Design a protein around this ligand. Sequence first.
Ligand SMILES: *C/C(=C/c1ccc(C#C)cc1)C(=O)OC
Length: 138
Amino acid sequence: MPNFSGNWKIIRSENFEELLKVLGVNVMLRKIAVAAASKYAVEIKQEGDTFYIKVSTTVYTTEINFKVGEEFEEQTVDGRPCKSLVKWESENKMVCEQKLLKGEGPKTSWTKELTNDGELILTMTADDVVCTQVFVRE
Ligand SMILES: *C/C(=C/c1ccc(C#C)cc1)C(=O)OC
């Protein structure tokens, strides 16, 4: 039955540069990151409240495994290691709060939502700034 599980390809990306800006990424690298973001692909396998998620671009790929409700370790959009904890906000929306392992920096979080007409929306927040990325099934 249809859930988050699937192969997703990006079709829109709003506010990504502004998010990197907040994270201290210089202009040249942000522009390269924006260009790379248009090949974001996401693969999700979901069973119950257990998730496997592989995000990749042209040159880079990462995998995370988590269970809703259980702390896990990942990294921030700008690659700082963090501790993460995902909770449901509705049937097909989940929200993750992150805390830096070492250091200080902006407050980061992310969401994933399956909409009623079959999109996956990702949002990523750093302080006041919200990047939204929309995906459709491959
Ligand atoms: C789930 C997830 C997807 C994602 C897309 C793009 C980037 C970048 C850079 C990172 C992740 C996530 O939690 O990212 C914050």
